[PDB]
Protein backbone atom coordinates (compact mmCIF):
# COMPACT_ATOMS: atom_id res chain seq x y z
CA UNK A 1 0.00 0.00 0.00
CA UNK A 2 0.97 3.66 0.29
CA UNK A 3 4.47 3.93 1.83
CA UNK A 4 3.46 6.79 4.14
CA UNK A 5 0.69 4.97 6.03
CA UNK A 6 1.29 4.12 9.69
CA UNK A 7 -0.80 2.44 12.40
CA UNK A 8 -0.68 3.61 16.02
CA UNK A 9 -2.12 1.88 19.11
CA UNK A 10 -1.45 1.28 22.81
CA UNK A 11 -1.36 -2.11 24.53
CA UNK A 12 -0.97 -2.92 28.22
CA UNK A 13 1.34 -5.12 30.26
CA UNK A 14 2.32 -5.08 33.93
CA UNK A 15 0.09 -2.06 34.42
CA UNK A 16 2.15 -0.07 31.91
CA UNK A 17 1.34 1.47 28.53
CA UNK A 18 3.16 0.49 25.35
CA UNK A 19 2.72 2.74 22.33
CA UNK A 20 3.22 0.78 19.09
CA UNK A 21 3.58 2.18 15.57
CA UNK A 22 3.55 -0.10 12.51
CA UNK A 23 4.64 0.86 9.01
CA UNK A 24 1.71 -0.97 7.41
CA UNK A 25 3.38 -1.50 4.03
CA UNK A 26 6.37 -3.25 5.64
CA UNK A 27 5.49 -4.51 9.12
CA UNK A 28 8.35 -2.48 10.62
CA UNK A 29 7.59 -1.53 14.22
CA UNK A 30 8.60 1.28 16.56
CA UNK A 31 7.52 1.21 20.18
CA UNK A 32 7.91 3.15 23.41
CA UNK A 33 6.80 2.58 27.00
CA UNK A 34 4.88 5.62 28.22
CA UNK A 35 3.79 6.46 31.79
CA UNK A 36 0.26 7.60 30.93
CA UNK A 37 -1.96 6.84 27.93
CA UNK A 38 -2.40 10.57 27.30
CA UNK A 39 -2.60 12.72 24.19
CA UNK A 40 0.58 14.52 25.22
CA UNK A 41 2.57 11.28 25.02
CA UNK A 42 0.92 10.41 21.69
CA UNK A 43 1.75 13.85 20.28
CA UNK A 44 5.39 13.71 21.36
CA UNK A 45 5.72 10.21 19.91
CA UNK A 46 4.21 11.42 16.63
CA UNK A 47 6.71 14.28 16.44
CA UNK A 48 9.56 11.82 16.93
CA UNK A 49 8.16 9.48 14.27
CA UNK A 50 7.55 12.13 11.60
CA UNK A 51 11.06 13.54 11.93
CA UNK A 52 12.44 10.10 11.09
CA UNK A 53 10.10 8.73 8.40
CA UNK A 54 7.90 10.26 5.69
CA UNK A 55 4.61 10.05 7.59
CA UNK A 56 1.60 10.95 5.44
CA UNK A 57 -1.36 9.35 7.22
CA UNK A 58 -1.88 7.62 10.56
CA UNK A 59 -4.58 5.06 11.35
CA UNK A 60 -5.60 3.67 14.72
CA UNK A 61 -8.03 1.19 16.23
CA UNK A 62 -9.12 3.71 18.91
CA UNK A 63 -10.18 6.85 17.06
CA UNK A 64 -10.56 8.74 20.33
CA UNK A 65 -6.76 8.53 20.63
CA UNK A 66 -6.56 11.38 18.11
CA UNK A 67 -9.13 13.86 19.45
CA UNK A 68 -6.97 15.78 21.92
CA UNK A 69 -5.78 19.26 21.02
CA UNK A 70 -2.16 18.21 21.59
CA UNK A 71 -2.44 15.38 19.05
CA UNK A 72 -4.07 17.54 16.38
CA UNK A 73 -1.38 20.19 16.94
CA UNK A 74 1.38 17.64 16.34
CA UNK A 75 -0.27 16.33 13.16
CA UNK A 76 -0.81 19.88 11.94
CA UNK A 77 2.81 20.91 12.37
CA UNK A 78 4.21 17.73 10.81
CA UNK A 79 1.65 17.74 7.99
CA UNK A 80 0.01 14.46 9.03
CA UNK A 81 -3.52 13.43 8.06
CA UNK A 82 -5.70 10.86 9.77
CA UNK A 83 -7.04 7.79 7.98
CA UNK A 84 -2.99 -6.77 12.16
CA UNK A 85 -2.05 -9.15 14.98
CA UNK A 86 1.18 -7.14 15.31
CA UNK A 87 0.30 -6.42 18.94
CA UNK A 88 -0.09 -10.18 19.42
CA UNK A 89 3.19 -11.13 17.74
CA UNK A 90 5.04 -8.38 19.61
CA UNK A 91 3.43 -9.57 22.84
CA UNK A 92 4.65 -13.05 21.91
CA UNK A 93 8.30 -12.04 21.53
CA UNK A 94 8.01 -9.86 24.64
CA UNK A 95 6.82 -12.87 26.60
CA UNK A 96 9.72 -14.88 25.18
CA UNK A 97 12.40 -12.37 26.22
CA UNK A 98 10.83 -10.92 29.38
CA UNK A 99 13.09 -12.77 31.83
CA UNK A 100 16.37 -11.49 30.32
CA UNK A 101 15.59 -7.91 31.37
CA UNK A 102 14.59 -6.23 34.62
CA UNK A 103 12.40 -3.46 33.18
CA UNK A 104 9.52 -3.96 30.76
CA UNK A 105 10.78 -1.24 28.40
CA UNK A 106 14.04 -3.13 27.83
CA UNK A 107 12.11 -6.26 26.86
CA UNK A 108 9.86 -4.17 24.60
CA UNK A 109 12.86 -2.78 22.74
CA UNK A 110 14.38 -6.27 22.57
CA UNK A 111 11.16 -7.55 21.00
CA UNK A 112 11.10 -4.65 18.53
CA UNK A 113 14.69 -5.51 17.59
CA UNK A 114 13.89 -9.19 17.04
CA UNK A 115 10.74 -8.47 15.02
CA UNK A 116 12.40 -5.88 12.77
CA UNK A 117 15.45 -8.10 12.16
CA UNK A 118 13.55 -11.38 11.67
CA UNK A 119 13.87 -12.77 8.15
CA UNK A 120 10.68 -13.68 6.30
CA UNK A 121 13.01 -13.12 2.34
CA UNK A 122 13.93 -9.63 3.50
CA UNK A 123 13.20 -8.43 7.04
CA UNK A 124 10.81 -5.72 8.20
CA UNK A 125 13.60 -3.15 8.57
CA UNK A 126 15.03 -3.96 5.16
CA UNK A 127 11.52 -3.78 3.70
CA UNK A 128 10.70 -0.34 5.13
CA UNK A 129 14.06 1.04 4.01
CA UNK A 130 13.66 -0.42 0.51
CA UNK A 131 10.05 0.77 0.09
CA UNK A 132 10.84 4.30 1.21
CA UNK A 133 14.00 4.39 -0.91
CA UNK A 134 12.24 3.08 -4.02
CA UNK A 135 9.53 5.70 -3.48
CA UNK A 136 12.39 8.21 -3.74
CA UNK B 1 31.84 5.89 4.64
CA UNK B 2 30.55 2.63 6.08
CA UNK B 3 26.72 2.75 6.28
CA UNK B 4 26.64 1.21 9.77
CA UNK B 5 28.72 3.87 11.55
CA UNK B 6 26.96 6.12 14.06
CA UNK B 7 28.11 8.94 16.36
CA UNK B 8 26.65 9.39 19.84
CA UNK B 9 27.06 12.36 22.21
CA UNK B 10 25.21 14.40 24.84
CA UNK B 11 24.80 18.18 24.82
CA UNK B 12 23.22 20.43 27.46
CA UNK B 13 20.52 23.09 27.44
CA UNK B 14 18.34 24.51 30.21
CA UNK B 15 20.02 22.16 32.65
CA UNK B 16 18.80 19.15 30.66
CA UNK B 17 20.60 16.40 28.76
CA UNK B 18 20.08 15.82 25.04
CA UNK B 19 21.36 12.54 23.60
CA UNK B 20 22.16 12.92 19.89
CA UNK B 21 22.94 10.16 17.39
CA UNK B 22 24.20 10.94 13.88
CA UNK B 23 24.33 8.52 10.96
CA UNK B 24 27.75 9.73 9.87
CA UNK B 25 27.41 8.67 6.23
CA UNK B 26 24.19 10.69 5.81
CA UNK B 27 23.91 13.36 8.52
CA UNK B 28 20.56 11.93 9.64
CA UNK B 29 19.94 12.63 13.32
CA UNK B 30 17.97 10.99 16.11
CA UNK B 31 17.73 12.66 19.50
CA UNK B 32 16.10 12.22 22.88
CA UNK B 33 15.95 14.33 26.04
CA UNK B 34 17.07 12.24 29.01
CA UNK B 35 16.80 13.06 32.73
CA UNK B 36 20.31 11.95 33.71
CA UNK B 37 23.48 11.55 31.64
CA UNK B 38 23.81 7.95 32.82
CA UNK B 39 24.91 4.72 31.18
CA UNK B 40 21.43 3.27 31.70
CA UNK B 41 19.90 5.96 29.49
CA UNK B 42 22.66 5.49 26.90
CA UNK B 43 22.10 1.71 26.87
CA UNK B 44 18.33 2.01 26.46
CA UNK B 45 18.80 4.54 23.66
CA UNK B 46 21.26 2.19 21.93
CA UNK B 47 18.76 -0.67 22.11
CA UNK B 48 16.12 1.54 20.51
CA UNK B 49 18.53 2.65 17.78
CA UNK B 50 19.82 -0.82 16.85
CA UNK B 51 16.31 -2.23 16.51
CA UNK B 52 15.58 0.42 13.88
CA UNK B 53 18.80 0.72 11.85
CA UNK B 54 21.68 -1.63 10.98
CA UNK B 55 24.12 -0.38 13.63
CA UNK B 56 27.61 -1.86 13.24
CA UNK B 57 29.89 0.57 15.09
CA UNK B 58 29.35 3.57 17.35
CA UNK B 59 31.80 6.43 17.88
CA UNK B 60 31.69 9.17 20.48
CA UNK B 61 33.65 12.25 21.55
CA UNK B 62 33.54 11.17 25.23
CA UNK B 63 34.92 7.64 25.36
CA UNK B 64 34.00 7.33 29.03
CA UNK B 65 30.36 7.35 27.88
CA UNK B 66 30.82 3.70 26.88
CA UNK B 67 32.56 2.22 29.94
CA UNK B 68 29.54 1.35 32.07
CA UNK B 69 28.46 -2.27 32.36
CA UNK B 70 24.97 -1.37 31.15
CA UNK B 71 26.32 0.14 27.92
CA UNK B 72 28.60 -2.80 27.15
CA UNK B 73 25.69 -5.17 27.80
CA UNK B 74 23.51 -3.33 25.27
CA UNK B 75 26.26 -3.35 22.63
CA UNK B 76 26.91 -7.03 23.27
CA UNK B 77 23.29 -8.07 22.82
CA UNK B 78 22.77 -5.95 19.69
CA UNK B 79 26.14 -6.94 18.21
CA UNK B 80 27.57 -3.41 18.28
CA UNK B 81 31.29 -2.61 18.25
CA UNK B 82 32.94 0.61 19.37
CA UNK B 83 35.05 2.74 17.04
CA UNK B 84 30.97 17.34 13.05
CA UNK B 85 29.29 20.61 14.10
CA UNK B 86 26.01 18.67 14.10
CA UNK B 87 25.52 19.61 17.75
CA UNK B 88 26.01 23.24 16.72
CA UNK B 89 23.60 23.14 13.77
CA UNK B 90 21.01 21.29 15.86
CA UNK B 91 21.48 23.84 18.63
CA UNK B 92 20.94 26.51 15.97
CA UNK B 93 17.58 25.15 14.80
CA UNK B 94 16.61 24.49 18.43
CA UNK B 95 17.28 28.14 19.23
CA UNK B 96 15.22 29.14 16.20
CA UNK B 97 12.16 27.08 17.20
CA UNK B 98 12.41 27.22 21.00
CA UNK B 99 9.60 29.74 21.50
CA UNK B 100 6.95 27.70 19.63
CA UNK B 101 7.04 24.96 22.28
CA UNK B 102 6.72 24.87 26.06
CA UNK B 103 9.05 21.94 26.77
CA UNK B 104 12.61 21.60 25.52
CA UNK B 105 12.04 18.05 24.25
CA UNK B 106 9.34 19.27 21.85
CA UNK B 107 11.73 21.85 20.39
CA UNK B 108 14.44 19.19 20.15
CA UNK B 109 12.18 16.91 18.12
CA UNK B 110 11.08 19.88 16.00
CA UNK B 111 14.74 20.63 15.26
CA UNK B 112 15.42 16.98 14.41
CA UNK B 113 12.45 17.09 12.03
CA UNK B 114 13.68 20.25 10.30
CA UNK B 115 17.27 19.00 10.00
CA UNK B 116 16.29 15.59 8.62
CA UNK B 117 13.83 17.09 6.12
CA UNK B 118 16.03 20.01 4.99
CA UNK B 119 17.06 19.76 1.34
CA UNK B 120 20.75 20.07 0.51
CA UNK B 121 19.90 17.71 -3.38
CA UNK B 122 18.37 14.97 -1.26
CA UNK B 123 17.73 15.43 2.46
CA UNK B 124 19.34 13.65 5.40
CA UNK B 125 16.41 11.26 5.82
CA UNK B 126 16.31 10.46 2.12
CA UNK B 127 20.09 9.95 2.19
CA UNK B 128 20.09 7.51 5.11
CA UNK B 129 17.22 5.52 3.59
CA UNK B 130 18.93 5.41 0.18
CA UNK B 131 22.35 4.45 1.57
CA UNK B 132 20.94 1.65 3.72
CA UNK B 133 18.72 0.44 0.87
CA UNK B 134 21.55 0.46 -1.68
CA UNK B 135 23.69 -1.47 0.81
CA UNK B 136 20.90 -4.08 0.66
C1 LIG C 1 18.92 -2.32 34.53
N1 LIG C 1 19.81 -2.93 33.57
C2 LIG C 1 19.49 -3.24 32.33
C3 LIG C 1 18.15 -3.03 31.62
O1 LIG C 1 17.71 -1.70 31.80
C4 LIG C 1 18.22 -0.68 30.98
C5 LIG C 1 18.33 -1.08 29.50
C6 LIG C 1 17.27 0.51 31.07
C7 LIG C 1 19.60 -0.25 31.48
C8 LIG C 1 17.04 -3.95 32.13
O2 LIG C 1 15.86 -3.51 32.21
O3 LIG C 1 17.30 -5.14 32.45
C9 LIG C 1 20.60 -3.81 31.72
C10 LIG C 1 20.62 -4.23 30.41
C11 LIG C 1 21.32 -3.50 29.45
C12 LIG C 1 21.31 -3.90 28.13
C13 LIG C 1 20.58 -5.03 27.75
C14 LIG C 1 19.87 -5.75 28.71
C15 LIG C 1 19.87 -5.35 30.04
C16 LIG C 1 19.05 -7.01 28.30
C17 LIG C 1 18.95 -7.13 26.80
C18 LIG C 1 20.19 -6.70 26.09
O4 LIG C 1 20.59 -5.41 26.37
C19 LIG C 1 21.63 -3.82 32.67
C20 LIG C 1 22.96 -4.26 32.66
C21 LIG C 1 23.74 -4.14 33.80
C22 LIG C 1 23.20 -3.58 34.95
C23 LIG C 1 21.89 -3.15 34.97
C24 LIG C 1 21.09 -3.27 33.81
C1 LIG D 1 2.40 20.96 26.13
N1 LIG D 1 1.94 21.04 24.75
C2 LIG D 1 2.69 20.82 23.69
C3 LIG D 1 4.18 20.44 23.65
O1 LIG D 1 4.42 19.36 24.51
C4 LIG D 1 4.14 18.05 24.07
C5 LIG D 1 4.58 17.78 22.63
C6 LIG D 1 4.91 17.08 24.98
C7 LIG D 1 2.65 17.76 24.19
C8 LIG D 1 5.11 21.58 24.08
O2 LIG D 1 6.15 21.31 24.74
O3 LIG D 1 4.85 22.77 23.76
C9 LIG D 1 1.91 21.00 22.56
C10 LIG D 1 2.38 20.83 21.28
C11 LIG D 1 1.99 19.71 20.54
C12 LIG D 1 2.49 19.52 19.26
C13 LIG D 1 3.40 20.44 18.72
C14 LIG D 1 3.79 21.55 19.47
C15 LIG D 1 3.29 21.74 20.75
C16 LIG D 1 4.80 22.59 18.88
C17 LIG D 1 5.42 22.07 17.61
C18 LIG D 1 4.46 21.29 16.76
O4 LIG D 1 3.90 20.21 17.40
C19 LIG D 1 0.62 21.33 23.00
C20 LIG D 1 -0.59 21.62 22.34
C21 LIG D 1 -1.72 21.92 23.08
C22 LIG D 1 -1.66 21.94 24.47
C23 LIG D 1 -0.46 21.66 25.12
C24 LIG D 1 0.68 21.35 24.37
Coordinates of C-alpha atoms and ligand atoms in Angstrom, one line a residue:
Chain A
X1 CA 0.0 0.0 0.0
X2 CA 1.0 3.7 0.3
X3 CA 4.5 3.9 1.8
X4 CA 3.5 6.8 4.1
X5 CA 0.7 5.0 6.0
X6 CA 1.3 4.1 9.7
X7 CA -0.8 2.4 12.4
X8 CA -0.7 3.6 16.0
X9 CA -2.1 1.9 19.1
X10 CA -1.5 1.3 22.8
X11 CA -1.4 -2.1 24.5
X12 CA -1.0 -2.9 28.2
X13 CA 1.3 -5.1 30.3
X14 CA 2.3 -5.1 33.9
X15 CA 0.1 -2.1 34.4
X16 CA 2.2 -0.1 31.9
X17 CA 1.3 1.5 28.5
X18 CA 3.2 0.5 25.3
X19 CA 2.7 2.7 22.3
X20 CA 3.2 0.8 19.1
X21 CA 3.6 2.2 15.6
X22 CA 3.6 -0.1 12.5
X23 CA 4.6 0.9 9.0
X24 CA 1.7 -1.0 7.4
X25 CA 3.4 -1.5 4.0
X26 CA 6.4 -3.3 5.6
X27 CA 5.5 -4.5 9.1
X28 CA 8.3 -2.5 10.6
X29 CA 7.6 -1.5 14.2
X30 CA 8.6 1.3 16.6
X31 CA 7.5 1.2 20.2
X32 CA 7.9 3.2 23.4
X33 CA 6.8 2.6 27.0
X34 CA 4.9 5.6 28.2
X35 CA 3.8 6.5 31.8
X36 CA 0.3 7.6 30.9
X37 CA -2.0 6.8 27.9
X38 CA -2.4 10.6 27.3
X39 CA -2.6 12.7 24.2
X40 CA 0.6 14.5 25.2
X41 CA 2.6 11.3 25.0
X42 CA 0.9 10.4 21.7
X43 CA 1.8 13.9 20.3
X44 CA 5.4 13.7 21.4
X45 CA 5.7 10.2 19.9
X46 CA 4.2 11.4 16.6
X47 CA 6.7 14.3 16.4
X48 CA 9.6 11.8 16.9
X49 CA 8.2 9.5 14.3
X50 CA 7.5 12.1 11.6
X51 CA 11.1 13.5 11.9
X52 CA 12.4 10.1 11.1
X53 CA 10.1 8.7 8.4
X54 CA 7.9 10.3 5.7
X55 CA 4.6 10.0 7.6
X56 CA 1.6 10.9 5.4
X57 CA -1.4 9.3 7.2
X58 CA -1.9 7.6 10.6
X59 CA -4.6 5.1 11.3
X60 CA -5.6 3.7 14.7
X61 CA -8.0 1.2 16.2
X62 CA -9.1 3.7 18.9
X63 CA -10.2 6.9 17.1
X64 CA -10.6 8.7 20.3
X65 CA -6.8 8.5 20.6
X66 CA -6.6 11.4 18.1
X67 CA -9.1 13.9 19.5
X68 CA -7.0 15.8 21.9
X69 CA -5.8 19.3 21.0
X70 CA -2.2 18.2 21.6
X71 CA -2.4 15.4 19.1
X72 CA -4.1 17.5 16.4
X73 CA -1.4 20.2 16.9
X74 CA 1.4 17.6 16.3
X75 CA -0.3 16.3 13.2
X76 CA -0.8 19.9 11.9
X77 CA 2.8 20.9 12.4
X78 CA 4.2 17.7 10.8
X79 CA 1.6 17.7 8.0
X80 CA 0.0 14.5 9.0
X81 CA -3.5 13.4 8.1
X82 CA -5.7 10.9 9.8
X83 CA -7.0 7.8 8.0
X84 CA -3.0 -6.8 12.2
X85 CA -2.0 -9.2 15.0
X86 CA 1.2 -7.1 15.3
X87 CA 0.3 -6.4 18.9
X88 CA -0.1 -10.2 19.4
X89 CA 3.2 -11.1 17.7
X90 CA 5.0 -8.4 19.6
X91 CA 3.4 -9.6 22.8
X92 CA 4.7 -13.0 21.9
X93 CA 8.3 -12.0 21.5
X94 CA 8.0 -9.9 24.6
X95 CA 6.8 -12.9 26.6
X96 CA 9.7 -14.9 25.2
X97 CA 12.4 -12.4 26.2
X98 CA 10.8 -10.9 29.4
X99 CA 13.1 -12.8 31.8
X100 CA 16.4 -11.5 30.3
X101 CA 15.6 -7.9 31.4
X102 CA 14.6 -6.2 34.6
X103 CA 12.4 -3.5 33.2
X104 CA 9.5 -4.0 30.8
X105 CA 10.8 -1.2 28.4
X106 CA 14.0 -3.1 27.8
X107 CA 12.1 -6.3 26.9
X108 CA 9.9 -4.2 24.6
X109 CA 12.9 -2.8 22.7
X110 CA 14.4 -6.3 22.6
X111 CA 11.2 -7.5 21.0
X112 CA 11.1 -4.6 18.5
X113 CA 14.7 -5.5 17.6
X114 CA 13.9 -9.2 17.0
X115 CA 10.7 -8.5 15.0
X116 CA 12.4 -5.9 12.8
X117 CA 15.4 -8.1 12.2
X118 CA 13.6 -11.4 11.7
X119 CA 13.9 -12.8 8.1
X120 CA 10.7 -13.7 6.3
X121 CA 13.0 -13.1 2.3
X122 CA 13.9 -9.6 3.5
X123 CA 13.2 -8.4 7.0
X124 CA 10.8 -5.7 8.2
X125 CA 13.6 -3.1 8.6
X126 CA 15.0 -4.0 5.2
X127 CA 11.5 -3.8 3.7
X128 CA 10.7 -0.3 5.1
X129 CA 14.1 1.0 4.0
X130 CA 13.7 -0.4 0.5
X131 CA 10.1 0.8 0.1
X132 CA 10.8 4.3 1.2
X133 CA 14.0 4.4 -0.9
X134 CA 12.2 3.1 -4.0
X135 CA 9.5 5.7 -3.5
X136 CA 12.4 8.2 -3.7
Chain B
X1 CA 31.8 5.9 4.6
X2 CA 30.5 2.6 6.1
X3 CA 26.7 2.8 6.3
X4 CA 26.6 1.2 9.8
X5 CA 28.7 3.9 11.6
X6 CA 27.0 6.1 14.1
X7 CA 28.1 8.9 16.4
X8 CA 26.7 9.4 19.8
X9 CA 27.1 12.4 22.2
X10 CA 25.2 14.4 24.8
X11 CA 24.8 18.2 24.8
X12 CA 23.2 20.4 27.5
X13 CA 20.5 23.1 27.4
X14 CA 18.3 24.5 30.2
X15 CA 20.0 22.2 32.6
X16 CA 18.8 19.2 30.7
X17 CA 20.6 16.4 28.8
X18 CA 20.1 15.8 25.0
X19 CA 21.4 12.5 23.6
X20 CA 22.2 12.9 19.9
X21 CA 22.9 10.2 17.4
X22 CA 24.2 10.9 13.9
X23 CA 24.3 8.5 11.0
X24 CA 27.8 9.7 9.9
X25 CA 27.4 8.7 6.2
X26 CA 24.2 10.7 5.8
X27 CA 23.9 13.4 8.5
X28 CA 20.6 11.9 9.6
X29 CA 19.9 12.6 13.3
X30 CA 18.0 11.0 16.1
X31 CA 17.7 12.7 19.5
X32 CA 16.1 12.2 22.9
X33 CA 15.9 14.3 26.0
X34 CA 17.1 12.2 29.0
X35 CA 16.8 13.1 32.7
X36 CA 20.3 11.9 33.7
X37 CA 23.5 11.6 31.6
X38 CA 23.8 7.9 32.8
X39 CA 24.9 4.7 31.2
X40 CA 21.4 3.3 31.7
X41 CA 19.9 6.0 29.5
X42 CA 22.7 5.5 26.9
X43 CA 22.1 1.7 26.9
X44 CA 18.3 2.0 26.5
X45 CA 18.8 4.5 23.7
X46 CA 21.3 2.2 21.9
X47 CA 18.8 -0.7 22.1
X48 CA 16.1 1.5 20.5
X49 CA 18.5 2.6 17.8
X50 CA 19.8 -0.8 16.9
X51 CA 16.3 -2.2 16.5
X52 CA 15.6 0.4 13.9
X53 CA 18.8 0.7 11.9
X54 CA 21.7 -1.6 11.0
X55 CA 24.1 -0.4 13.6
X56 CA 27.6 -1.9 13.2
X57 CA 29.9 0.6 15.1
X58 CA 29.3 3.6 17.4
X59 CA 31.8 6.4 17.9
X60 CA 31.7 9.2 20.5
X61 CA 33.6 12.2 21.5
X62 CA 33.5 11.2 25.2
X63 CA 34.9 7.6 25.4
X64 CA 34.0 7.3 29.0
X65 CA 30.4 7.3 27.9
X66 CA 30.8 3.7 26.9
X67 CA 32.6 2.2 29.9
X68 CA 29.5 1.3 32.1
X69 CA 28.5 -2.3 32.4
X70 CA 25.0 -1.4 31.1
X71 CA 26.3 0.1 27.9
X72 CA 28.6 -2.8 27.2
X73 CA 25.7 -5.2 27.8
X74 CA 23.5 -3.3 25.3
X75 CA 26.3 -3.3 22.6
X76 CA 26.9 -7.0 23.3
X77 CA 23.3 -8.1 22.8
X78 CA 22.8 -6.0 19.7
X79 CA 26.1 -6.9 18.2
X80 CA 27.6 -3.4 18.3
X81 CA 31.3 -2.6 18.2
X82 CA 32.9 0.6 19.4
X83 CA 35.1 2.7 17.0
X84 CA 31.0 17.3 13.1
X85 CA 29.3 20.6 14.1
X86 CA 26.0 18.7 14.1
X87 CA 25.5 19.6 17.8
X88 CA 26.0 23.2 16.7
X89 CA 23.6 23.1 13.8
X90 CA 21.0 21.3 15.9
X91 CA 21.5 23.8 18.6
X92 CA 20.9 26.5 16.0
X93 CA 17.6 25.1 14.8
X94 CA 16.6 24.5 18.4
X95 CA 17.3 28.1 19.2
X96 CA 15.2 29.1 16.2
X97 CA 12.2 27.1 17.2
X98 CA 12.4 27.2 21.0
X99 CA 9.6 29.7 21.5
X100 CA 7.0 27.7 19.6
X101 CA 7.0 25.0 22.3
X102 CA 6.7 24.9 26.1
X103 CA 9.0 21.9 26.8
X104 CA 12.6 21.6 25.5
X105 CA 12.0 18.1 24.2
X106 CA 9.3 19.3 21.8
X107 CA 11.7 21.9 20.4
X108 CA 14.4 19.2 20.1
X109 CA 12.2 16.9 18.1
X110 CA 11.1 19.9 16.0
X111 CA 14.7 20.6 15.3
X112 CA 15.4 17.0 14.4
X113 CA 12.5 17.1 12.0
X114 CA 13.7 20.2 10.3
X115 CA 17.3 19.0 10.0
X116 CA 16.3 15.6 8.6
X117 CA 13.8 17.1 6.1
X118 CA 16.0 20.0 5.0
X119 CA 17.1 19.8 1.3
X120 CA 20.8 20.1 0.5
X121 CA 19.9 17.7 -3.4
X122 CA 18.4 15.0 -1.3
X123 CA 17.7 15.4 2.5
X124 CA 19.3 13.6 5.4
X125 CA 16.4 11.3 5.8
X126 CA 16.3 10.5 2.1
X127 CA 20.1 10.0 2.2
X128 CA 20.1 7.5 5.1
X129 CA 17.2 5.5 3.6
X130 CA 18.9 5.4 0.2
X131 CA 22.4 4.4 1.6
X132 CA 20.9 1.7 3.7
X133 CA 18.7 0.4 0.9
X134 CA 21.5 0.5 -1.7
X135 CA 23.7 -1.5 0.8
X136 CA 20.9 -4.1 0.7
Ligands
LIG1 C1 18.9 -2.3 34.5 N1 19.8 -2.9 33.6 C2 19.5 -3.2 32.3 C3 18.1 -3.0 31.6 O1 17.7 -1.7 31.8 C4 18.2 -0.7 31.0 C5 18.3 -1.1 29.5 C6 17.3 0.5 31.1 C7 19.6 -0.2 31.5 C8 17.0 -3.9 32.1 O2 15.9 -3.5 32.2 O3 17.3 -5.1 32.5 C9 20.6 -3.8 31.7 C10 20.6 -4.2 30.4 C11 21.3 -3.5 29.5 C12 21.3 -3.9 28.1 C13 20.6 -5.0 27.7 C14 19.9 -5.8 28.7 C15 19.9 -5.3 30.0 C16 19.1 -7.0 28.3 C17 18.9 -7.1 26.8 C18 20.2 -6.7 26.1 O4 20.6 -5.4 26.4 C19 21.6 -3.8 32.7 C20 23.0 -4.3 32.7 C21 23.7 -4.1 33.8 C22 23.2 -3.6 35.0 C23 21.9 -3.1 35.0 C24 21.1 -3.3 33.8
LIG2 C1 2.4 21.0 26.1 N1 1.9 21.0 24.8 C2 2.7 20.8 23.7 C3 4.2 20.4 23.6 O1 4.4 19.4 24.5 C4 4.1 18.0 24.1 C5 4.6 17.8 22.6 C6 4.9 17.1 25.0 C7 2.7 17.8 24.2 C8 5.1 21.6 24.1 O2 6.2 21.3 24.7 O3 4.9 22.8 23.8 C9 1.9 21.0 22.6 C10 2.4 20.8 21.3 C11 2.0 19.7 20.5 C12 2.5 19.5 19.3 C13 3.4 20.4 18.7 C14 3.8 21.6 19.5 C15 3.3 21.7 20.8 C16 4.8 22.6 18.9 C17 5.4 22.1 17.6 C18 4.5 21.3 16.8 O4 3.9 20.2 17.4 C19 0.6 21.3 23.0 C20 -0.6 21.6 22.3 C21 -1.7 21.9 23.1 C22 -1.7 21.9 24.5 C23 -0.5 21.7 25.1 C24 0.7 21.3 24.4

